[PDB]
Amino acid sequence: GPHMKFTVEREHLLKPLQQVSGPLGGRPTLPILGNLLLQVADGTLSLTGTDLEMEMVARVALVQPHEPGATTVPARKFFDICRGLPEGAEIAVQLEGERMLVRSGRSRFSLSTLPAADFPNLDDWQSEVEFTLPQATMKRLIEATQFSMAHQDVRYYLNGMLFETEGEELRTVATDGHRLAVCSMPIGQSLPSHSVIVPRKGVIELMRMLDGGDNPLRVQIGSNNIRAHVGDFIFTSKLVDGRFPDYRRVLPKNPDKHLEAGCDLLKQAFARAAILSNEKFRGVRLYVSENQLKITANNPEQEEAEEILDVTYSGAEMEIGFNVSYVLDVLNALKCENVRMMLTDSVSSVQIEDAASQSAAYVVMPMRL
């Protein structure tokens, strides 16, 4: 009757248990947050584990006879019993009173459990944004914009990605002060305008839960949390508050002097500059001339390096000294064959873009000279 009946081989239960064991750290803020929520319903077992900030749920199909139910069981206990059985063990878990009875041949366990209804409240989510996209684009967005995320900053909002979910072009933006990275991809369907800031703990988990396959990535975004969906595994992450500086407002609109250069040669030059770079402010200067890029590396130890790059330019003479890491990681994320860019004197943003596509862009500001 009130006996959540459950029966599965341990092979189909080992991996989902490990998947839902992520948020379960050492000491949970709430006591019940140190447990797993087990639900047998509609011929499916749902495993839920939460950290009051992120939730991971794994679903497994059920073929053995069962009775629907729900119960919250100790995390590390249940995992230890499930893992400690011999290979091929057929675990049969039942609910008697307030106890999980785990039976397997001649082995019997009676674990103490918490009511299912006392596990926070994983409801009230009325998502206003819902979209499914291929894995390649989801990976590419964060490949493009992960480097430019600020970490351990007083401004909380700078520590997370911004998914700009508006119109049809889905965008991801990450600005670490001077560094700005934006990437736009068409997903297929129109949708209202939203700007959602996802914490680093959310995107770092997203990257581990994206794998190659036929996954549609049914992403549901609400006002305070974002949720991702693979067919068997689903994930939830809260959102970091604060506003966000408008990337489009700091994009160079008026100026039009364009510079073109290769990628790999710039890679080698900037990597050589980074080797034994400036001790304190590891940034170097450049003099842009007509179809010419001179780069100088200066150090507090008088160390000087000068190189000349043959490029395409149709503008004026400018002198601009940046931080090498910023442009290095910008080019690394852009990963194209040739880069178009613009940079002007005084205080003006250096824009870097793929010469073949405008789906991604980067903004870097030099230092004082």
Partner 1 sequence: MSYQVLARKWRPQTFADVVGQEHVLTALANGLSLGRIHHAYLFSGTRGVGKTSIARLLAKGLNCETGITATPCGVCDNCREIEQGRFVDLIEIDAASRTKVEDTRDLLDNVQYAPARGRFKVYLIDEVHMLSRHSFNALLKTLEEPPEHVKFLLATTDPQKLPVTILSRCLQFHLKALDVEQIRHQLEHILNEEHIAHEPRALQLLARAAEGSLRDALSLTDQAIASGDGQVSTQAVSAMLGTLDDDQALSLVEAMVEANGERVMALINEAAARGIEWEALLVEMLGLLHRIAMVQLSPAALGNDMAAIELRMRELARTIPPTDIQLYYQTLLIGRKELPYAPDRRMGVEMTLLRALAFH
Partner 2 sequence: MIRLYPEQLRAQLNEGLRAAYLLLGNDPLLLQESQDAVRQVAAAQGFEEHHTFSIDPNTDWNAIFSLCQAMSLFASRQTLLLLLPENGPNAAINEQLLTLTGLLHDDLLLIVRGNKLSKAQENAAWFTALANRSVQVTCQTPEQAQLPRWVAARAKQLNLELDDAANQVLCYCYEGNLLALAQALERLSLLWPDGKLTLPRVEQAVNDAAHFTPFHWVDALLMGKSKRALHILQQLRLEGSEPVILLRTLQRELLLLVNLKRQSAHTPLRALFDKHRVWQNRRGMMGEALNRLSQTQLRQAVQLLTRTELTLKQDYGQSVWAELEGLSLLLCH
Nearer to its own copies, 153 or 303 (CB): 303
The annotated binding site is made up of 27, 76, 152, 156-157
State the nearest-atom distance from the C-beta of 51 to partner 1, in Å. Answer: 10
Strand partners, 223: none
SS (H, E, C) 102-159: EEECCEEEEEECECHHHCCCCCCCCCCEEEECCHHHHHHHHHHHCCCCCCCCCCHHHH
Q: Which residue has the tokens 């003099």?
A: 287
Query: Which pair of structure tokens corresponds to residue 319?
Result: 């002198």
Tokens found for residue 187: 């997903």
Using the rule CB under 8 A, give the single segment among 108-116, 118-126, 137-145, 196-204 that binds its own copies: 108-116
Smallest separation (angstroms) from partner 1 to the CB of 191: 21
Question: Residue 108 interacts with its own copies (CB under 8 A)?
Answer: yes
**Minimum CB distance to partner 2 smaller for 172 or for 236:** 172
Residues lying near partner 1 in the complex (CB under 8 A) are found at 27, 29, 52-53, 118, 120-121, 124, 154, 156, 159, 199, 223-225, 238-242
Binding status of residue 87 toward its own copies by CB under 8 A:
no
Residue located via tokens 């940034």: 283
Question: What is the SS3 assignment for 289?
Answer: strand
Q: Work out which of 20, 57, 58, 81 binds its own copies, going by CB under 8 A.
A: 81
Q: How far is the CB of 152 from partner 1 (least distance, A)?
A: 10
Binding mask 88-107 for its own copies (x = CB under 8 A): -----------x------xx
Residues tagged in the binding site annotation for DNA: 27, 76, 152, 156-157
- Residues at the site binding partner 2, with contacts judged by CB under 8 A: 154, 175, 177-180, 245-246, 249-250, 280-281, 323, 347, 349, 363-368
**Is 257 an interacting residue with respect to its own copies (CB under 8 A)?**
no
CB atoms within 10 A of CB 234: 19
Region near its own copies per CB under 8 A, out of 15-23, 141-149, 198-206, 271-279: 271-279
Return the one option of partner 2, partner 1, its own copies, none that residue 364 interacts with (CB less than 5 to 8 A, by type).
Answer: partner 2
14 in contact with its own copies (CB under 8 A): no
Half-sphere exposure of 44 (CA within 13 A, CB side): 12
316 binds, among its own copies, partner 1, partner 2, none (CB under 5 to 8 A by kind): none
- Which region among 15-23, 80-88, 157-165, 344-352 touches its own copies (by CB under 8 A)? 80-88
Check residue 276 for interaction with its own copies (CB under 8 A): yes
307 binding partner (options partner 2, partner 1, its own copies, none; Cβ < 5 to 8 Å by kind): its own copies
Q: State the SS3 of 158-213.
A: HHCEEEEEEEEEEEEEEEECCEEEEEEEEEEEEEEEEEEEECHHHHHHHHHHCCCC
Q: Which residues pair with 350 in a beta bridge?
A: 364
Q: How far apart are CA 69 and CA 75, in angstroms?
A: 18
DSSP reduced 3-state for 12: helix
Tell me how far apart the alpha carbons of residues 187 and 134 are, in angstroms, rounded to a whole number. 8
Number of Cβ within 10 Å of residue 54's Cβ equals 18
Main-chain dihedrals φ then ψ at residue 97, nearest 5 degrees: 60, -115
53 binds, among partner 1, partner 2, its own copies, none (CB under 5 to 8 A by kind): partner 1
Q: Which of residues 309-338 bind its own copies (CB under 8 A)?
A: 309
Cα(151)–Cα(200) distance, rounded to whole angstroms? 8
Q: Taking contact as CB under 8 A, which single stretch among the options 27-35, 63-71, 170-178, 265-273 is the one that binds its own copies?
A: 265-273
Residue type, 320: I
Residue 109 contacts which entry, partner 1, its own copies, partner 2, none (Cβ below 5-8 A, type-dependent): its own copies
The closest alpha carbon to 19, from 55, 43, 44, belongs to 55
DSSP bridge pairs for 321? 285, 367
Interface with its own copies by CB under 8 A: which residues? 77, 80-81, 84-86, 99, 106-112, 268, 271-272, 275-276, 301-309
